[PDB]
Amino acid sequence: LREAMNSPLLDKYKVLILDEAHERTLATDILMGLIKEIVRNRADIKVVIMSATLDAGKFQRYFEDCPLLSVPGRTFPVEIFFTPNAEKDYLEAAIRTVIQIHMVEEVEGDILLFLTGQEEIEEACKRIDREIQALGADAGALSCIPLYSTLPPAAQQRIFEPAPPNRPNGAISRKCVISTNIAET
RNA sequence: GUUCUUCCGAGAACAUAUACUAAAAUUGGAACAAUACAGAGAAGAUUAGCAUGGCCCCUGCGCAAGGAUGACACGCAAAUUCGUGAAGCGUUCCAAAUUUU
Ligand SMILES: [Mg+2]
Ligand SMILES: [Mg+2]
Structure with a gap:
């Protein structure tokens, strides 16, 4: 967009x-319109609009029914799950969910919990630390890492840290990263 | 006033205090007749009665018997006095998803 304003x-x-x-x-929204305007005039320039989401071909219309190319390609399949009833206090549910997973899942892995912001990601860390301090020696060590866009560099860098070597009894230790949408994209 | 005295115009005896004192003038207290109008004790109603109470009477010779069982009674039915633990308070809140030139 900065270049076009000169040329x-x-x-x-x-x-x-x-x-x-x-x-x-x-x-991007500005560009697309001007670039369709460009697609008039400079009648030699190719445009390839890519989208990573499956979106309902609204792009296909907008650019004069341009040809749509669909390419699949995920790395692994994912399981999706729902609660059958609608819990009324989500943070109480999220915190409760974290503990439940930590205790019941036998597969190694980290938990990535999506919350709304720092008033909650700093609460959720504290309260999850309380219940793991209750579950004592049997349960594996859970490490709770907050992650939001205004944490200083050193506090961000934690997310690269690997999990413990787990407790001797075979209890899986896990890292729990609690994060806004910064972990989404 | 009437009977006696006489020197004669006075004396003596008898007789002794009635009457809301009115032909009045004033000033009050009871019960009558009835216009249009409705209903007179007893836990739904139709209804004998006998009591109870007292600054309420009437008829009755009356300690008999009657008058709506004479009437009234008919609710705010409030009268010697407390003991317990919680909670506001003593004046006081509320907060940054991602990110690009
Ligand atoms: Mg009756
Ligand atoms: Mg009678």
């Missing part, structure tokens, strides 16, 4: 590629 037809460019279109950022 409206993007004169240096032959093939554009507007990646990650799903994120729909103010930079």
Whole structure:
């Protein structure tokens, strides 16, 4: 967007590629419109709008029914789960969920819990620490790591830390990263 | 006033205090007749009665018997006095998802 404001037809460019279109950022929304305007005029320049989300081909219309290419490719399959009734206090549920997983799941792995913000990610750390201090020696060590966009560098760097070597009884120790949408994308 | 005295115009005896004192003038207290109008004790109703009480009477010779069982009684039915533990308070809140030039 900064280049176009000096050179409206993007004169240096032959093939554009507007990646990650799903994120729909103010930079991107402006671009797309001007770039469709460019697709008039500079009638030699290719445009390849990529999106990583499956989105309902609204992009396909917008650009004069341009051809849509679908490419699959995840790495592993994921299991999805729901609560059958609707819990009325989600943080009490989330905290309770973390403990439940820590105790019952036999597979090694870390827990990534999505909360709304620092008023909660700093509460959820504390309260989850309380119940693991209650569960004592049998349960594996759970390490609770907050993660939000304004943590200083040293506090962010924790997330790279590996789990304990687990307790001797075979109880799986785990890292629990509690994070806003910074862990989403 | 009437009977006696006489020197004669006075004397003596008898007789002794009635009457809400009115032909009045004033000033009160009871019961009558009845216009339009409704219903007179007893835990639904139809209804004998006998009591109880007292600054309420009437008829009755009356300690008999009657008057709506004479009437009234008919609710705010409030009268010697407390003992317990919680909670506001003594004046006082509420908070940053991601991120780009
Ligand atoms: Mg009766
Ligand atoms: Mg009678």
